[PDB]
Design an enzyme around this catalytic site. Structure first.
Site, PDB file in Angstrom:
ATOM      1  N   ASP A  48       0.836  -1.352   0.057  1.00  0.00           N
ATOM      2  CA  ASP A  48       0.094  -0.129  -0.036  1.00  0.00           C
ATOM      3  C   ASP A  48       0.769   1.281   0.031  1.00  0.00           C
ATOM      4  O   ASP A  48       1.258   1.698   1.134  1.00  0.00           O
ATOM      5  CB  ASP A  48      -0.805   0.112   1.278  1.00  0.00           C
ATOM      6  CG  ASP A  48      -1.646   1.243   1.064  1.00  0.00           C
ATOM      7  OD1 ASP A  48      -2.087   1.858   0.169  1.00  0.00           O
ATOM      8  OD2 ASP A  48      -2.566   1.450   2.271  1.00  0.00           O
ATOM      9  N   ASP A  62      -1.478   5.541  -5.057  1.00  0.00           N
ATOM     10  CA  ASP A  62      -2.107   4.936  -4.118  1.00  0.00           C
ATOM     11  C   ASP A  62      -2.524   3.450  -4.329  1.00  0.00           C
ATOM     12  O   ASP A  62      -3.428   2.880  -5.043  1.00  0.00           O
ATOM     13  CB  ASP A  62      -3.278   5.416  -3.672  1.00  0.00           C
ATOM     14  CG  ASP A  62      -3.807   4.825  -2.384  1.00  0.00           C
ATOM     15  OD1 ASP A  62      -3.241   3.718  -1.933  1.00  0.00           O
ATOM     16  OD2 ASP A  62      -4.868   5.262  -1.839  1.00  0.00           O
TER      17      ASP A  62
HETATM   18  C1  LIG Z   1      -3.947   5.876   6.396  1.00  0.00           C
HETATM   19  C2  LIG Z   1      -4.433   7.128   6.488  1.00  0.00           C
HETATM   20  C3  LIG Z   1      -3.123   8.161   6.034  1.00  0.00           C
HETATM   21  C4  LIG Z   1      -4.888   7.694   7.847  1.00  0.00           C
HETATM   22  C5  LIG Z   1      -5.429   7.293   4.888  1.00  0.00           C
HETATM   23  C6  LIG Z   1      -6.556   7.921   5.245  1.00  0.00           C
HETATM   24  C7  LIG Z   1      -7.497   8.069   4.263  1.00  0.00           C
HETATM   25  C8  LIG Z   1      -7.118   8.100   2.706  1.00  0.00           C
HETATM   26  C9  LIG Z   1      -5.760   7.242   2.569  1.00  0.00           C
HETATM   27  C10 LIG Z   1      -5.307   7.220   1.123  1.00  0.00           C
HETATM   28  N1  LIG Z   1      -4.906   5.823   0.963  1.00  0.00           N
HETATM   29  C11 LIG Z   1      -6.070   4.658   1.311  1.00  0.00           C
HETATM   30  C12 LIG Z   1      -7.188   4.633   0.404  1.00  0.00           C
HETATM   31  S1  LIG Z   1      -8.526   3.587   0.647  1.00  0.00           S
HETATM   32  O1  LIG Z   1      -8.963   3.738   2.110  1.00  0.00           O
HETATM   33  C13 LIG Z   1      -7.307   2.132   0.409  1.00  0.00           C
HETATM   34  C14 LIG Z   1      -6.388   2.247   1.781  1.00  0.00           C
HETATM   35  C15 LIG Z   1      -5.496   0.710   2.162  1.00  0.00           C
HETATM   36  C16 LIG Z   1      -6.549  -0.336   2.375  1.00  0.00           C
HETATM   37  C17 LIG Z   1      -7.593  -0.395   3.469  1.00  0.00           C
HETATM   38  C18 LIG Z   1      -8.466  -1.549   3.640  1.00  0.00           C
HETATM   39  F1  LIG Z   1      -9.193  -1.412   4.772  1.00  0.00           F
HETATM   40  C19 LIG Z   1      -8.750  -2.188   2.754  1.00  0.00           C
HETATM   41  N2  LIG Z   1      -9.723  -3.253   2.860  1.00  0.00           N
HETATM   42  C20 LIG Z   1      -7.862  -2.347   1.318  1.00  0.00           C
HETATM   43  O2  LIG Z   1      -8.260  -3.187   0.517  1.00  0.00           O
HETATM   44  C21 LIG Z   1      -8.358  -2.770  -1.092  1.00  0.00           C
HETATM   45  C22 LIG Z   1      -9.825  -2.847  -1.401  1.00  0.00           C
HETATM   46  F2  LIG Z   1     -10.140  -2.477  -2.613  1.00  0.00           F
HETATM   47  F3  LIG Z   1     -10.472  -1.973  -0.553  1.00  0.00           F
HETATM   48  F4  LIG Z   1     -10.375  -4.092  -1.077  1.00  0.00           F
HETATM   49  C23 LIG Z   1      -7.491  -3.707  -1.827  1.00  0.00           C
HETATM   50  F5  LIG Z   1      -7.584  -3.686  -3.144  1.00  0.00           F
HETATM   51  F6  LIG Z   1      -6.148  -3.550  -1.585  1.00  0.00           F
HETATM   52  F7  LIG Z   1      -7.677  -5.103  -1.405  1.00  0.00           F
HETATM   53  C24 LIG Z   1      -6.915  -1.316   1.214  1.00  0.00           C
HETATM   54  C25 LIG Z   1      -5.287   3.384   1.341  1.00  0.00           C
HETATM   55  O3  LIG Z   1      -4.462   3.212   2.223  1.00  0.00           O
HETATM   56  C26 LIG Z   1      -5.014   7.313   3.721  1.00  0.00           C
END
Ligand SMILES: CC(C)(C)c1cccc(CN[C@H]2C[S@](=O)C[C@@H](Cc3cc(F)c(N)c(OC(C(F)(F)F)C(F)(F)F)c3)[C@@H]2O)c1
Length: 376
Positions: free
Chosen positions: A35, A219
């Site tokens: 990630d 991302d």
């Molecule tokens: C962490 C901080 C800095 C606080 C933050 C807050 C809000 C937005 C961001 C920007 N990055 C975010 C964007 S979204 O929430 C996915 C997240 C990582 C993440 C968290 C999860 F729960 C899951 N399930 C996940 O799995 C995905 C999915 F497609 F959702 F299945 C798969 F495709 F990878 F499987 C992936 C990133 O990290 C960071």
């Protein structure tokens, strides 16, 4: 020695890409989501219906409790747990072991994904956005500080899926043509500046500030290309017009309903290519990456018993800026050159195929006043 990291990623469509790691002594094996959109390294450490295995701290002799809690709220999912350190290795990675911060996840809400095959997350972005705060050193920072691994990594995400994470360098066998670099605007997310957008060669002609409102980031943890409201609307309108030969459910464009065609008859030709122009390395210079519909129409397993080709629209609306997610990165080789504060793009060895069109990274272009495209 990068060949040992080629093809070290696996995944399922729509469920991210993961790499194998081991934590603790003796080594406990876990698959970890890659990630670039976050900065915490965290692993399941308690039973969960979607976890087939997890980190057992009591069984590791090198575990150390930091006696501090932690939680991370992502856009959709979230978890909480307890901070600690342990020794960590990447079997198909550099031949090193590091003591890294690890968040042991004890409770979660829509974080783990059923059937994803990963049990943790590796946040590769900068300390500025680490929780609970920027004093928690991220894994890659610990890796660089403790070893001689160069301060960069590259991702080749391929379109049930695989790819490569090259830690510490660039593997020239994984891309063709030239690498084109855009500055990392600020070291928190991997933030970049988009300076122009075209759909089938036609400029969207918005204030370029709109493209980066309130930021634009790269991302790998997000599936879709996500666009600010105003930009999303202009893009969908243009994409609708280009494909107006066929009518689609209003829920298709919202990512809710999937559309199917007879296997092998998907009308790729009626969907436009999308070009994103990024700020370049020299004055008034940019470059573009071009995205084919084979990227933003994500393949999904047939909802019926029939064998049609079905797809979901993988472009969606954002309220937190542009997100260049996995479907943008797929087919490109993306270099996260932290050392030189830049991100490189090149056409990947596993690039996306179309009969009469091709994904591309092209330059140089001239673009005046690119500085004005950044949001403040
Ligand atoms: C962490 C901080 C800095 C606080 C933050 C807050 C809000 C937005 C961001 C920007 N990055 C975010 C964007 S979204 O929430 C996915 C997240 C990582 C993440 C968290 C999860 F729960 C899951 N399930 C996940 O799995 C995905 C999915 F497609 F959702 F299945 C798969 F495709 F990878 F499987 C992936 C990133 O990290 C960071």
């Amino acid at each position: 020695s990068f060949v040992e990291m080629v093809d070290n990623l696996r995944g399922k469509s729509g469920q991210g890409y993961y790499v194998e790691m081991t934590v603790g002594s003796p080594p406990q094996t876990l698959n970890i989501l890659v990630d670039t959109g976050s900065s915490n390294f965290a692993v399941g450490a308690a039973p969960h219906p979607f976890l087939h295995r997890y980190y057992q701290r009591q069984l590791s002799s090198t575990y150390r409790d930091l006696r501090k809690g932690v939680y991370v709220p992502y856009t959709q999912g979230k978890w909480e747990g307890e901070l600690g350190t342990d020794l960590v290795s990447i079997p198909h990675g550099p031949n090193v072991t590091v003591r890294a911060n690890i968040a042991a996840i004890t409770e979660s809400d829509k974080f783990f994904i059923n059937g994803s095959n990963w049990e943790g997350i590796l946040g590769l972005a900068y300390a500025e956005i680490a929780r609970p705060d920027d004093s928690l050193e991220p894994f890659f920072d610990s890796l660089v500080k403790q070893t001689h691994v160069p301060n960069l990594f590259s991702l080749q995400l391929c379109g049930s899926v695989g790819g490569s994470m090259i830690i510490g360098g660039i593997d020239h066998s994984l891309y063709t043509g030239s690498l084109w670099y855009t500055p990392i605007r600020r070291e928190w997310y991997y933030e970049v500046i988009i300076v122009r957008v075209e759909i089938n060669g036609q400029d969207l002609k918005m204030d370029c500030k709109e493209y980066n409102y309130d930021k634009s980031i790269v991302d790998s943890g997000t599936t879709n290309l996500r666009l600010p409201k105003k930009v999303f609307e202009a893009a969908v309108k243009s994409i609708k017009a280009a494909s107006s030969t066929e009518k689609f459910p209003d829920g298709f464009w919202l990512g809710e309903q999937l559309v199917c065609w007879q296997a092998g008859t998907t009308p790729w030709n009626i969907f436009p290519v999308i070009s994103l122009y990024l700020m370049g390395e020299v004055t008034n210079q940019s470059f573009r990456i071009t995205i084919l519909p084979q990227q933003y129409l994500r393949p999904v397993e047939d909802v019926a018993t029939s064998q049609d080709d079905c797809y979901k629209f993988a472009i969606s609306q954002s309220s937190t800026g542009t997100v260049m997610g996995a479907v943008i990165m797929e087919g490109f080789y993306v270099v996260f050159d932290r050392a030189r504060k830049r991100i490189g793009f090149a056409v990947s060895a596993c690039h996306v195929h179309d009969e009469f069109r091709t994904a591309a990274v092209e330059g140089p272009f001239v673009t005046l006043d690119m500085e004005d495209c950044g949001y403040n």
